[PDB]
Design a protein around this ligand. Structure first.
Ligand code: CHL
Ligand code: CHL
Ligand code: CLA
Ligand code: CLA
Ligand code: CLA
Ligand code: CLA
Ligand SMILES: CCCCCCCCC/C=C\C(=O)OC\C(=C/C=C/C(C)=C/C=C/C=C(C)/C=C/C=C(C)/C=C/[C@H]1C(C)=C[C@H](O)CC1(C)C)C(=O)CC1=C(C)C[C@@H](O)CC1(C)C
Ligand SMILES: CC1=C[C@H](O)CC(C)(C)[C@H]1/C=C/C(C)=C/C=C/C(C)=C/C=C/C=C(C)/C=C/C=C(\CO)C(=O)CC1=C(C)C[C@@H](O)CC1(C)C
Ligand SMILES: CC1=C[C@H](O)CC(C)(C)[C@H]1/C=C/C(C)=C/C=C/C(C)=C/C=C/C=C(C)/C=C/C=C(\CO)C(=O)CC1=C(C)C[C@@H](O)CC1(C)C
Ligand SMILES: CC1=C[C@H](O)CC(C)(C)[C@H]1/C=C/C(C)=C/C=C/C(C)=C/C=C/C=C(C)/C=C/C=C(\CO)C(=O)CC1=C(C)C[C@@H](O)CC1(C)C
Ligand SMILES: CC1=C[C@H](O)CC(C)(C)[C@H]1/C=C/C(C)=C/C=C/C(C)=C/C=C/C=C(C)/C=C/C=C(\CO)C(=O)CC1=C(C)C[C@@H](O)CC1(C)C
Ligand SMILES: [Mg+2]
Ligand SMILES: [Mg+2]
Lengths: 222, 223, 223
């Protein structure tokens, strides 16, 4: 019910008139949603599927990456320089630098210029290998190469492969949706996601988003 | 006719001849031959953008009247709202007394934004669902012009005047969208309501115009 | 030899083939095979985007020289402008005496912002009309390369050097657009002019670089 003509659509029963002809159920995540007609061209639709999933993979890492140090500081008694994700980058400018987990023996980076231009070379080469191949194999598929990147062979079965593609893109869209939550939540409340959540569950009727509705993405206008 | 077909009005007047794409043929309402960014070269995308544009235009038409009415009512009709300016109207739900319609505490008198929010989700969620796939008030025969229960006075029964009404609708809407964009930037830049801006301007148009606030970037006084 | 056709230079160097869309074949200037978002898969849109890009590149090329000239002239040529920094240059029309060209009160000496604005509307309005459909300086034979009155020195008469000049034009223009993007973000972040940023940087590059302002979001010091 996630592929083919009898798949799930993005409006449930009210989908009978809101699914374009080119969204036929072939690709993962096809809920028949393209109201803006941005993927009518088959080549562009291929590009947007590549844009979407690559984003979804970064968001999946992002939600765990943003929540982990804040959850470790608030519930694991760990002492980071800055454990909140939107302030975490700034701990490179403090005295002592960026000590991993607060431990000065771990990483302990002192120069943002080294962090920056090391990432440029590594990610520059790594992304170059993604489009045209490199040390860890040939780029047989822009999203699912599954050579060195499927060591446990979880994509070997063609039938479960089709279902795993669905699980990947649905969890990824949830992660992207959450990362967008982090962004506006941080501008609006000024606090980290863990702290936002904790404050909310304590008094959900009083600790929700509408408390900050008088600000425009942080800015207190009017 | 001068709003359809090959001799219709174009978006550059006489300087148009060389700035009209081949796929803008004069078929749909509002076709002034303007798609310089080639965003509607695909016929299917063009179909979506016409639906986006008109659906926007209908919200803008309601918006301009919706934004101006309580402010015009307060400034010239002596009505006492909690917040009569559109961009401050939402905040009245957090004020004491809540959202009193027309200022009357016996009208609406809403106290909970959470109730306003999740009521609109259900009502608009179904209403938009009925728009794409039909529902209680008929079948969604056309994404923009169903005209069943939504043409009760049958003004679209004549094919010729129907074509002229479609033109009037999309032109008034683009004017409304263009005006709502005015509301947005005027509020960020001046901080006042549209009615007050209009009144202040005609008082001294040479001194009360936009360039007084050009040193601010959409409200922010940078540099 | 290496900027057109199948053996041209691409936007990822050796890692490029397999990251070049089928519709980027080497025919047009600047074709490094970069359209990862597939925004130009449609031939007609791709035609529009090439016009958007090049017209921007020409405005950016004029922009970089226009933004750097008064700031470099004021700080290194002993010239006294009213406001020599580009993002402050527009505001000098609101000061007393107005916009004196090069600071000399006998040059221009504009006093009305409304006069500058609505003269530009008429002049640029007609000029852009002449660009799409032709006019006094000839017919619009080509949307980007008319080369009638706009190639008086006939530098594009040789077909081979024309092909190379087209390449140089788009590469210098993309650098200018990329640089203008630098001006925009640099001014929001640092609050200083491009020349002064350059001068401050070369004095102590390890301490006078962008990361000093990384805690601000395009000017705003949030968090
Ligand atoms: C003959 C001259 C003629 C000209 C030049 C135009 C030109 C235009 N028309 Mg047409 N029309 C003309 C005749 C006619 N029009 C129409 C019917 C229409 C219609 C329905 C519409 C147009 C629209 C437009 C605009 C669309 C292009 C654009 O956005 O450029 C503008 C781009 C620019 C770069 C101009 C800006 C210059 C300005 C000085 C910038 C200001 C500087 C700021 C202060 C600095 C900013 C700072 C930063 C930080 C923000 C454009 C101004 C459309 C419109 O209104 O969209 C806006 C539209 O919807 N025209 C008819 C009836 C048949 C005509 C009769 O001859
Ligand atoms: C999402 C973007 C982002 C990406 C793709 C990376 C990617 C990387 N970082 Mg990271 N970083 C990123 C944001 C940030 N990093 C850091 C601080 C670091 C440090 C201290 C280190 C990395 C390192 C690395 C590498 C991982 C192990 C080698 C890899 C190239 C490591 C590295 O490059 O060592 C060679 C390493 O020591 N990053 C901060 C805080 C300033 C960030 C955001 O503000
Ligand atoms: C693409 C994913 C991503 C990225 C860019 C980052 C980025 C960062 N993490 Mg992080 N993290 C991530 C995923 C990610 N995380 C995930 C998925 C986990 C859980 C396994 C963690 C667990 C984690 C811890 C426990 C710590 C970081 C820390 C850091 C910072 C320094 C990292 C370092 O020294 O490298 C090496 C940096 C802001 C360190 C830091 O400064 O905390 C804020 C730190 O102590 N991260
Ligand atoms: C919910 C998370 C999730 C899920 C279900 C998948 C699912 C899949 N990924 Mg995937 N991926 C994810 C997150 C996820 N990914 C993230 C965050 C990244 C960025 C590091 C990637 C990077 C990635 C690459 C580079 C490759 C895959 C591949 C695959 C496929 C086979 C591997 C597999 O069964 O994964 C199992 C996943 C889990 C059991 C999740 C456990 C959570 C820890 C399958 C469709 C491979 C493929 O398609 O082979 C043909 C492949 O080459 N993914
Ligand atoms: C300039 C305004 C304007 C104009 C000219 C039109 C014109 C048209 N609309 Mg449209 N419409 C508008 C605004 C407008 N609409 C707005 C703001 C909305 C938002 C709800 C809609 C929603 C809408 C729907 C959902 C439908 C139409 C339909 C129609 C067509 C038949 C109705 C008609 O003749 O109305 C002429 C309009 C007026 C004379 C203006 C009336 C103004 C008063 C103040 C309204 C008072 C309301 C009580 C016609 C092309 C129907 C259609 O085409 O089906 C065949 C159809 O299904 N319109
Ligand atoms: C590095 C920048 C650059 C380059 C290489 C070109 C190159 C070209 N332009 Mg272009 N142009 C530029 C900037 C540039 N232009 C800018 C900034 C504008 C905005 C005014 C224009 C506006 C423009 C128009 C309107 C036309 C051209 C034309 C031409 C072509 C023939 C003229 C020529 O060789 O000029 C070479 C330029 C130089 C050698 C440098 C001069 C630099 C100083 C500052 C003057 C050629 C492909 C013509 C064409 O193709 O018609 C056949 C044409 O009609 N250009
Ligand atoms: C004729 C020959 C020339 C025609 C022509 O050129 O005009 C064509 C035409 C209209 C033409 C021209 C425009 C575009 C005026 C806009 C001027 C823009 C202004 C004043 C902007 C001010 C900006 C401010 C205040 C601040 C901005 C931002 C700044 C600083 C920064 C902030 O952070 C943001 C802020 C505040 C936002 C026709 O209507 C066309 C037509 C019609 C009707 C139908 C026909 O029958 C007859 C005819 C005549 C042709
Ligand atoms: C479908 C559709 C149909 C219509 O027809 C048209 C349409 C409506 C337009 C269209 C709809 C489309 C929609 C809904 C679009 C939505 C897009 C969204 C929300 C994208 C979100 C993506 C967000 C990402 C990648 C976040 C990555 C996080 C990282 C990096 O991995 C870090 O956190 C890294 C990190 C960590 C982990 C810790 C910190 O310390 C430091 C930093 C660097 C911040
Ligand atoms: C039916 C069904 C069956 C399946 O079997 C399972 C299923 C699929 C799950 C299920 C489907 C269910 C469906 C359709 C769910 C639909 C949910 C919707 C639309 C809910 C809408 C929520 C809207 C909200 C909270 C508004 C937030 C605004 C705030 C507060 O924070 C601002 O302050 C706004 C604001 C302001 C004022 C200023 C800005 O600066 C910042 C921001 C935050 C933007
Ligand atoms: C043509 C073209 C060709 C090229 O090739 C490419 C191109 C250049 C891109 C392209 C050009 C495209 C152009 C010009 C795009 C312009 C877009 C614009 C301005 C759209 C504006 C739309 C805005 C809307 C719907 C307003 C809604 C208002 C409401 C809702 O009713 C309320 O006020 C509701 C409301 C609220 C919520 C607050 C409360 O207090 C009460 C009230 C006031 C009623
Ligand atoms: C290989 C090769 C071969 C050919 O033969 C010749 C060749 C082609 C030349 C050559 C090609 C080379 C290649 C591939 C070059 C690659 C270069 C790259 C990727 C450069 C990386 C740069 C990254 C930087 C500095 C980050 C800057 C951001 C800052 C700090 O200044 C902020 O403040 C961040 C910031 C924040 C945090 C808050 C916001 O508000 C504002 C901003 C500014 C965004
Ligand atoms: Mg044109
Ligand atoms: Mg030609």
């Amino acid at each position: 019910e996630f592929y083919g003509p009898d798949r799930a659509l993005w409006l449930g029963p009210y989908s009978e008139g809101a699914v374009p002809s080119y969204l036929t159920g072939e690709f993962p995540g096809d809920y028949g949603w393209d109201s803006a007609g941005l993927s009518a061209d088959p080549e562009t639709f291929a590009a947007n599927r590549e844009l979407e999933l690559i984003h979804a993979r970064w968001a999946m890492l992002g939600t765990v990456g943003c929540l982990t140090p804040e959850a470790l500081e608030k519930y694991g008694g760990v002492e980071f320089g800055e454990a909140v994700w939107f302030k975490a980058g700034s701990q490179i400018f403090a005295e002592g630098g960026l000590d991993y987990l607060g431990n000065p023996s771990l990483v302990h980076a002192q120069s943002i210029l080294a962090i920056c231009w090391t990432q440029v070379v590594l990610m520059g080469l790594a992304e170059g290998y993604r489009c045209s191949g490199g040390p860890l194999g040939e780029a047989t598929d822009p999203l699912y190469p599954g050579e060195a990147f499927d060591p446990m062979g979880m994509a070997d079965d063609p039938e479960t492969f089709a279902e795993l593609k669905t699980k990947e893109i649905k969890n990824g869209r949830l992660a992207m949706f959450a990362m967008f939550g982090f962004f506006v939540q941080s501008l609006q409340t000024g606090k980290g996601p863990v702290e936002c959540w904790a404050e909310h569950i304590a008094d959900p009727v009083a600790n929700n988003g509408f408390v900050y509705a008088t600000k425009f993405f942080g800015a207190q206008i009017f």
